[PDB]
Write an enzyme that holds these catalytic residues in place. Sequence first.
Site, PDB file in Angstrom:
ATOM      1  N   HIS A  68      43.341  45.920  39.487  1.00  0.00           N
ATOM      2  CA  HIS A  68      41.895  45.917  39.145  1.00  0.00           C
ATOM      3  C   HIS A  68      41.389  47.272  38.662  1.00  0.00           C
ATOM      4  CE1 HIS A  68      41.982  42.109  41.504  1.00  0.00           C
ATOM      5  NE2 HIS A  68      41.216  41.747  40.501  1.00  0.00           N
ATOM      6  N   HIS A  72      42.897  46.686  33.193  1.00  0.00           N
ATOM      7  CA  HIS A  72      42.497  45.259  33.333  1.00  0.00           C
ATOM      8  C   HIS A  72      41.185  45.075  32.556  1.00  0.00           C
ATOM      9  CE1 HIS A  72      41.655  41.434  35.091  1.00  0.00           C
ATOM     10  NE2 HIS A  72      40.520  41.924  35.651  1.00  0.00           N
ATOM     11  N   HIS A 106      33.325  44.028  34.265  1.00  0.00           N
ATOM     12  CA  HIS A 106      33.287  42.865  35.178  1.00  0.00           C
ATOM     13  C   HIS A 106      33.918  43.231  36.517  1.00  0.00           C
ATOM     14  CE1 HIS A 106      37.461  42.106  34.296  1.00  0.00           C
ATOM     15  NE2 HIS A 106      37.455  41.257  35.305  1.00  0.00           N
ATOM     16  N   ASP A 107      34.726  44.298  36.629  1.00  0.00           N
ATOM     17  CA  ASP A 107      35.370  44.665  37.933  1.00  0.00           C
ATOM     18  C   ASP A 107      35.055  46.155  38.269  1.00  0.00           C
ATOM     19  OD1 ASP A 107      36.854  42.319  39.136  1.00  0.00           O
ATOM     20  OD2 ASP A 107      38.475  42.695  37.775  1.00  0.00           O
ATOM     21  N   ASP A 217      39.663  36.647  32.272  1.00  0.00           N
ATOM     22  CA  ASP A 217      40.027  37.310  33.537  1.00  0.00           C
ATOM     23  C   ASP A 217      41.474  37.031  33.898  1.00  0.00           C
ATOM     24  OD1 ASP A 217      39.500  39.062  35.501  1.00  0.00           O
ATOM     25  OD2 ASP A 217      38.497  37.635  36.816  1.00  0.00           O
ATOM     26  N   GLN A 269      53.454  31.379  42.277  1.00  0.00           N
ATOM     27  CA  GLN A 269      52.983  31.415  40.850  1.00  0.00           C
ATOM     28  C   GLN A 269      52.880  29.970  40.303  1.00  0.00           C
ATOM     29  OE1 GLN A 269      51.821  34.186  38.851  1.00  0.00           O
ATOM     30  NE2 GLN A 269      51.374  34.563  41.013  1.00  0.00           N
TER      31      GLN A 269
HETATM   32  C1  LIG Z   1      43.068  35.143  42.139  1.00  0.00           C
HETATM   33  N1  LIG Z   1      44.084  35.357  41.126  1.00  0.00           N
HETATM   34  N2  LIG Z   1      43.869  36.029  39.976  1.00  0.00           N
HETATM   35  C2  LIG Z   1      45.020  36.181  39.327  1.00  0.00           C
HETATM   36  C3  LIG Z   1      46.052  35.572  40.049  1.00  0.00           C
HETATM   37  C4  LIG Z   1      47.471  35.572  39.691  1.00  0.00           C
HETATM   38  O1  LIG Z   1      48.393  35.504  40.527  1.00  0.00           O
HETATM   39  N3  LIG Z   1      47.714  35.704  38.403  1.00  0.00           N
HETATM   40  C5  LIG Z   1      49.064  35.718  37.848  1.00  0.00           C
HETATM   41  C6  LIG Z   1      49.516  36.973  37.187  1.00  0.00           C
HETATM   42  N4  LIG Z   1      50.572  37.066  36.418  1.00  0.00           N
HETATM   43  C7  LIG Z   1      50.696  38.348  36.050  1.00  0.00           C
HETATM   44  C8  LIG Z   1      49.639  39.050  36.612  1.00  0.00           C
HETATM   45  O2  LIG Z   1      48.886  38.194  37.349  1.00  0.00           O
HETATM   46  C9  LIG Z   1      45.432  35.013  41.188  1.00  0.00           C
HETATM   47  C10 LIG Z   1      46.041  34.238  42.292  1.00  0.00           C
HETATM   48  O3  LIG Z   1      45.264  33.751  43.136  1.00  0.00           O
HETATM   49  N5  LIG Z   1      47.376  34.031  42.342  1.00  0.00           N
HETATM   50  C11 LIG Z   1      47.981  33.322  43.373  1.00  0.00           C
HETATM   51  N6  LIG Z   1      49.148  33.763  43.712  1.00  0.00           N
HETATM   52  C12 LIG Z   1      49.820  33.207  44.719  1.00  0.00           C
HETATM   53  N7  LIG Z   1      49.316  32.088  45.395  1.00  0.00           N
HETATM   54  C13 LIG Z   1      50.271  31.815  46.374  1.00  0.00           C
HETATM   55  C14 LIG Z   1      51.250  32.762  46.283  1.00  0.00           C
HETATM   56  C15 LIG Z   1      52.417  33.010  47.172  1.00  0.00           C
HETATM   57  C16 LIG Z   1      53.179  34.150  46.999  1.00  0.00           C
HETATM   58  C17 LIG Z   1      54.247  34.461  47.832  1.00  0.00           C
HETATM   59  C18 LIG Z   1      54.553  33.620  48.884  1.00  0.00           C
HETATM   60  C19 LIG Z   1      53.822  32.448  49.033  1.00  0.00           C
HETATM   61  C20 LIG Z   1      52.734  32.167  48.232  1.00  0.00           C
HETATM   62  N8  LIG Z   1      50.986  33.597  45.274  1.00  0.00           N
HETATM   63  C21 LIG Z   1      48.105  31.563  45.037  1.00  0.00           C
HETATM   64  C22 LIG Z   1      47.407  32.178  44.061  1.00  0.00           C
HETATM   65 MG   LIG Z   2      36.743  40.472  39.740  1.00  0.00          MG
HETATM   66 ZN   LIG Z   3      38.965  40.895  36.722  1.00  0.00          ZN
END
Ligand SMILES: [C]N1[N][C]C(C(=O)[N][C]C2=N[C][C]O2)=C1C(=O)[N]C1=NC2=N([C]C(C3=[C][C]=[C][C]=[C]3)=N2)[C]=[C]1
Ligand SMILES: [Mg+2]
Ligand SMILES: [Zn+2]
Length: 313
Positions: A68, A72, A106-107, A217, A269
């Site tokens: 973050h 990003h 946004h972060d 995002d 994943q």
């Molecule tokens: C909030 N968000 N954003 C972005 C993302 C990614 O993630 N996205 C994706 C990407 N690609 C490259 C970079 O980033 C997320 C999540 O949530 N993811 C998630 N991961 C996991 N889970 C469960 C697990 C585990 C691990 C180990 C053991 C057991 C369990 N891992 C749920 C959800």
């Molecule tokens: Mg955020």
């Molecule tokens: Zn973000």
Amino acid sequence: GLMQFTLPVRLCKEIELFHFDIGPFENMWPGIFVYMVHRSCGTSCFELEKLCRFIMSVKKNYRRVPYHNWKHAVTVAHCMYAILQNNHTLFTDLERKGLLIACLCHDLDHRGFSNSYLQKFDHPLAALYSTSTMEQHHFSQTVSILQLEGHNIFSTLSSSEYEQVLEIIRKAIIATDLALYFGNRKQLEEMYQTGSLNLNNQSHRDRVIGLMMTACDLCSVTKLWPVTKLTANDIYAEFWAEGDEMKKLGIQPIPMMDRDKKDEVPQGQLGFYNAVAIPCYTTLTQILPPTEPLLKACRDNLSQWEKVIRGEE
Ligand SMILES: [C]N1[N][C]C(C(=O)[N][C]C2=N[C][C]O2)=C1C(=O)[N]C1=NC2=N([C]C(C3=[C][C]=[C][C]=[C]3)=N2)[C]=[C]1
Ligand SMILES: [Mg+2]
Ligand SMILES: [Zn+2]
């Protein structure tokens, strides 16, 4: 006014594609963003003096966390740029302005901990903002930076245009709270299927901008597999740090945050791609057909995680 940013030829071409990686040269990221504003918006959208000052203050208010971080932020803006450039005529001038800025901000001031961890820690932000804790904080940080002397990139908008763009930004940043994405996508799903979806209805536009924000995002899953796989290590470095901090409050974290359960990352994943990523990019593509390349890359990455599980990587 006649000062374009220009990029080396490889970037000038690749930046147009959804799967562009902005590269490891941090000092090129501001220029990349200004390049994207100038093409999405115009060379007139912002005073360059003011935009450059805003960008450097936004950068300074991202922290040195594994995922973050300032990277990003620029990455998420680039995916929005690519959506906006593939849907020229669907968005107003105020929206194109707001959304790139929203994605960059946004972060802001993220600490690498989820909303749940702030609530369990009993952080002061969880007292101030009972839901969408960090996102209300990100929007708060954006307004503060806009109000620093010389940083008001919207100064030349009419009063009501200024209230509208700050409203686009507030809703775009709140929408990055994935807890809200589930309901937003289902409503968009119903509205598209029953044919009630209307982009002249503001409440519908707001839902569609929400989904765009979730798509931008999550866009790490829409890159080429080598990028997605190496960004996954950064996402998990945070998750596992939050897990550690759960164990120090005496709470077993979920497996996604327990570094002792790293073995199950591949199946984790899959779940994420099946429950969040694919549904996201599927509904986005039904509403905005030129965003289909994001769904195609997401599905290529699902198939790569299926291969990791089968021991072929
Ligand atoms: C909030 N968000 N954003 C972005 C993302 C990614 O993630 N996205 C994706 C990407 N690609 C490259 C970079 O980033 C997320 C999540 O949530 N993811 C998630 N991961 C996991 N889970 C469960 C697990 C585990 C691990 C180990 C053991 C057991 C369990 N891992 C749920 C959800
Ligand atoms: Mg955020
Ligand atoms: Zn973000």
